[PDB]
Amino acid sequence: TGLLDGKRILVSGIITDSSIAFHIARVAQEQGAQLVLTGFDRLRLIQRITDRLPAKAPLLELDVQNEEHLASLAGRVTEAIGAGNKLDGVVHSIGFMPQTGMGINPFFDAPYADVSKGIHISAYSYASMAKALLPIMNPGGSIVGMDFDPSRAMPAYNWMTVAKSALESVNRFVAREAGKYGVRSNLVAAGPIRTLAMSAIVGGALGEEAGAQIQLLEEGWDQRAPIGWNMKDATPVAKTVCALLSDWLPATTGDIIYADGGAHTQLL
Amino acid sequence: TGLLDGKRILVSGIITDSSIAFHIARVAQEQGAQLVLTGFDRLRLIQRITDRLPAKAPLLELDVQNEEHLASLAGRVTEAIGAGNKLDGVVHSIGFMPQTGMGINPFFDAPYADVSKGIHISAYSYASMAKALLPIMNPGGSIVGMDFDPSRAMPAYNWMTVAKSALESVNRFVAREAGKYGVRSNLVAAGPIRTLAMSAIVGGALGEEAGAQIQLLEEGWDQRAPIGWNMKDATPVAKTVCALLSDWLPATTGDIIYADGGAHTQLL
Amino acid sequence: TGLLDGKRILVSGIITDSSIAFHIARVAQEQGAQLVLTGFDRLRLIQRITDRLPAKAPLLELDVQNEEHLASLAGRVTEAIGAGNKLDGVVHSIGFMPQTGMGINPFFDAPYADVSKGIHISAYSYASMAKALLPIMNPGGSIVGMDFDPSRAMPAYNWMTVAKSALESVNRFVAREAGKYGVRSNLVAAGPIRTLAMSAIVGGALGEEAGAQIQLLEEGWDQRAPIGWNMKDATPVAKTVCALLSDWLPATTGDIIYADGGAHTQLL
Amino acid sequence: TGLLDGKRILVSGIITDSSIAFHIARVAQEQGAQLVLTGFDRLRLIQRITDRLPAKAPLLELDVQNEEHLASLAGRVTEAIGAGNKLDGVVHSIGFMPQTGMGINPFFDAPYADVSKGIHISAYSYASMAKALLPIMNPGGSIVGMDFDPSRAMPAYNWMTVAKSALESVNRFVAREAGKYGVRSNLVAAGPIRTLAMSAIVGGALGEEAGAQIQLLEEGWDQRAPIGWNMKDATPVAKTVCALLSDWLPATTGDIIYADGGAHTQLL
Ligand SMILES: NC(=O)c1ccc[n+]([C@@H]2O[C@H](COP(=O)([O-])OP(=O)(O)OC[C@H]3O[C@@H](n4cnc5c(N)ncnc54)[C@H](O)[C@@H]3O)[C@@H](O)[C@H]2O)c1
Ligand SMILES: NC(=O)c1ccc[n+]([C@@H]2O[C@H](COP(=O)([O-])OP(=O)(O)OC[C@H]3O[C@@H](n4cnc5c(N)ncnc54)[C@H](O)[C@@H]3O)[C@@H](O)[C@H]2O)c1
Numbered sequence A, B, C, D: 001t002g003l004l005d006g007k008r009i010l011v012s013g014i015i016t017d018s019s020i021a022f023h024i025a026r027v028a029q030e031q032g033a034q035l036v037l038t039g040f041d042r043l044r045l046i047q048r049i050t051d052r053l054p055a056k057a058p059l060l061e062l063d064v065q066n067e068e069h070l071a072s073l074a075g076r077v078t079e080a081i082g083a084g085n086k087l088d089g090v091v092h093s094i095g096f097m098p099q100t101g102m103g104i105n106p107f108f109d110a111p112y113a114d115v116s117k118g119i120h121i122s123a124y125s126y127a128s129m130a131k132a133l134l135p136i137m138n139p140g141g142s143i144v145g146m147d148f149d150p151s152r153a154m155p156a157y158n159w160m161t162v163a164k165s166a167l168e169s170v171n172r173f174v175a176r177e178a179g180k181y182g183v184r185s186n187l188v189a190a191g192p193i194r195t196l197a198m199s200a201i202v203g204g205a206l207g208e209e210a211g212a213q214i215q216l217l218e219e220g221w222d223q224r225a226p227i228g229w230n231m232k233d234a235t236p237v238a239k240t241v242c243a244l245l246s247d248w249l250p251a252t253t254g255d256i257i258y259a260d261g262g263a264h265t266q267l268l
């Protein structure tokens, strides 16, 4: 018997086969979950990547900055899962910050429009998704978002760290609203993961100094983590998201679970 | 298939049928775990209470303040589980603070010997148990302890809160040592639970003012918790301990999971 | 000898005589600081209110959302303090969240444009001010911003709490940039203060339920605070801002000082 | 006019001229405070070191583990400051952990008696001192203790970190009791300081690996700190203690002020 046997779960954020959400979707399906997927802009690309998941899952277009996509979301989901069926889980694995807000570009040089775009996609959208999906969620349901520990400032991450701080605050309020539906809302704070974007940054896409800093940050992470950290393996992160989607953390809400090898609990 | 299918788990802290550890033991057995239990002082009492668990589990005497009990523990466990078998899980559900360190008795009036006894049992023993059990634990293993959020001072709990602050610090160091064995170490910070001791305190066993404060603390907790809090139900806490004992939080260590209805994430 | 004797300090955020920044400006002048003030929109109003300060201070127009005001700020300040003189201190006491983002209006109903306006003014502007003022700041300088503890979600404050979480994150990055100039950056997290806006909210300006919640929040605050909390007295907050502007906290940066009567350190 | 003009302050913890408390005492006297000093065991040594302070200060014997010294403390202080005079400030700058609880000696190998001694001196004594001194403290008074950020586990510091976690918890309760006298209670969390004991540890007194780890910890600290960290300079720490002893942080209690160059607010 699967951990998510009989659960209907919406998974957003797949772009490539290295996306954290691809691994969340794989593990959830291995655990008996019936999935509905949401994708942004490049849907032909997303459909081909998701064809490799162990089971079939309908794909729906969702640009979190689009008011029409959000207003029609619940109707499109229920149409994909069948009338009279509701979701048991929602996975928010969406994040973006324009290049001006990250890397070698000075912190003070990011124009507000770019910061605002990044916060809209990375933080506000967590509330936006919950607003659209809570009316079609079952009691005992679970909303999970992806976080990167922003409690301390760090090189290169810059305004994305600010967006994550706002996300953690948004999550605590989403928990208040979700509670009225008998639904939990939590974040998984993951360690660094070698996604296509991350590999590009290490490769110097956002500047040499930013690349050097991010590579050093990842090395320090594995060193600190009492059980180590493998940036090339998103499976421990995917399993943690599934733990929160399950009935096994029923008294946890407005909270953050750290899937970071325990690195944030250690100084050196 | 059970969440803890094939896992060998040691569970300490059963005294009565309302002990949090009784519920941890029940849920773990419902989930396919094979248990070994440890009990303090009143073993005839503990054996009769544990007879009501869905499956048989050997009972071993363990006074955490006794150096001989700790030195012979691993040998006694392996004798109960069979030579060549190791533990996959350890549950520390032990806590005690002499009456002088709690309730209406003034904070400044607790003599050091009493505070020291309370910290020995409630905090140091987490390290003591890990030292005794880590040599007989399998990689991928998990040690879980019971916590009561001590980040803020609260009426009546007094020196027990101080002992919990020390426990959280001990846990982060146990995580460093346990990591070398491929073992995780975490705490479950539970909301208030109506154990025999708790009911006695509400009943005024530690003074009227302390009883009034603890009853008010519990009411505020349910009010704050976005999903509510049922002090009479230890099952959500027991399930959370099992989530940490499972393979579903594999990247979490030196950490604290809050099974408190989300009360600590809300101000009012 | 005054605490801020010989210091040139910029103070933003005065709108009325009950503004926290009015009290910051008064105490700073009582302590020998030479001030330059910034005001938003209603400058005739601000000039008349600031006429009541114990000493004269030049007033400069500053709309933090205006790119031209920010680009000319340093030039206007240096013109007011004299060529060859730099600032020793900067006070950010600016906050705003459109009504849709606060009170009885549901959390999910705040449109992004309103949230974005609120975050621009309340969080991004802390970075904006530092970018404009750091080139005209002396080593040993200090930037202070006003915070309202957003670590936990609370009724009514809603998106303003989210903006404060973003502000705390912005502050840690401003500290990195300010450090290069030998300048500190910190926040003062104040308890609730009966400003004109706060009195209006208690009076039901943002809805009855929000008014009731905010009044209850303030009462709980004084109760929890080991030294109490007087919402009608901004002087303890003003003194704390001056402590950070002084040479008496020289090793504190990227940090938060709580001037809340110790309420955040107590559960009940 | 001095920051502590007319204040009567008790300063414990002087052992050598590099003790943090020596610098606290110097800065306080430079700021007009009238001091009373307490010393442990080697009083002839302490008297000769304190002779170098800018002004005379009476020295009283105080072993925090001695019940008689604590019971007679208030009487001895009032005798030194004159009948009808009370203290305005108390500085707790006392810390000790037996060698078994620190360095290369394994975390699990520290016997409870040694851990208990270390917690008695380093944490319980903060409550012990407050109990003895609060009856002879004026309203508006301030108690300050010395902390080393224990929120994360770190190599070598081991059980001393556990003692600091307990100290932070003790401080929040001392704040509750001190509030009844109109007195504040706070901790100063300092960065690493090259005291005689610290230099000895870097020199390998607690083992080579511990020495290497502590030297690395200090280097990382200066690197992270946006304003840097000078382990050879206790003056910024001494000034911060004086800020808390002054009337300039009147709304801060049960709290922790970080005098660490802002290192704890930065990840890398
Ligand atoms: N990679 C890491 O090291 C790391 C660590 C911790 C947390 N996270 C977080 O995990 C989440 C997933 O990112 P990832 O690392 O797997 O990278 P990714 O690039 O694989 O996924 C990000 C996703 O966001 C989507 N997205 C962007 N703008 C959108 C919009 N307007 N509407 C809808 N979707 C939009 C993209 O299509 C993409 O699928 C993000 O929240 C990220 O911040 C990443
Ligand atoms: N009850 C609550 O509200 C609450 C909330 C959060 C956390 N906790 C924690 O949960 C844990 C379990 O306590 P509980 O609430 O179930 O109460 P309990 O009284 O049922 O269990 C405490 C156990 O500690 C054992 N113990 C005491 N001294 C011992 C010693 N010297 N050696 C070995 N065992 C010893 C007792 O025998 C008992 O089985 C404790 O750590 C407690 O602090 C309790």
Ligand SMILES: NC(=O)c1ccc[n+]([C@@H]2O[C@H](COP(=O)([O-])OP(=O)(O)OC[C@H]3O[C@@H](n4cnc5c(N)ncnc54)[C@H](O)[C@@H]3O)[C@@H](O)[C@H]2O)c1
Binding pocket: C012, C013, C014, C015, C016, C018, C019, C020, C021, C039, C040, C062, C063, C064, C065, C092, C093, C094, C095, C096, C121, C146, C147, C148, C189, C190, C191, C192, C193, C194, C195, C196, C197, C198
């Ligand atoms: N009142 C409280 O209970 C409380 C508690 C903690 C923190 N704070 C914070 O203290 C700060 C000062 O607010 P206050 O409570 O004294 O109220 P206030 O209304 O007196 O001051 C807020 C100021 O922000 C200014 N402002 C708004 N939009 C601006 C813009 N576009 N450009 C420039 N300035 C702009 C206003 O002109 C006003 O002077 C804010 O950051 C607030 O969030 C308030």
Ligand SMILES: NC(=O)c1ccc[n+]([C@@H]2O[C@H](COP(=O)([O-])OP(=O)(O)OC[C@H]3O[C@@H](n4cnc5c(N)ncnc54)[C@H](O)[C@@H]3O)[C@@H](O)[C@H]2O)c1
Binding pocket: D012, D013, D014, D015, D016, D018, D019, D020, D021, D039, D040, D062, D063, D064, D065, D092, D093, D094, D095, D096, D121, D146, D147, D148, D189, D190, D191, D192, D193, D194, D195, D196, D197, D198
């Ligand atoms: N040195 C650092 O890097 C550092 C950093 C942060 C915090 N701290 C803390 O600062 C405080 C002062 O220590 P320090 O670093 O200046 O070292 P220190 O050795 O100079 O001072 C410690 C003092 O504690 C006293 N003490 C020990 N046992 C005692 C007892 N039984 N009764 C009374 N006094 C007793 C000693 O006599 C000594 O004066 C301690 O709490 C320490 O943990 C030190």
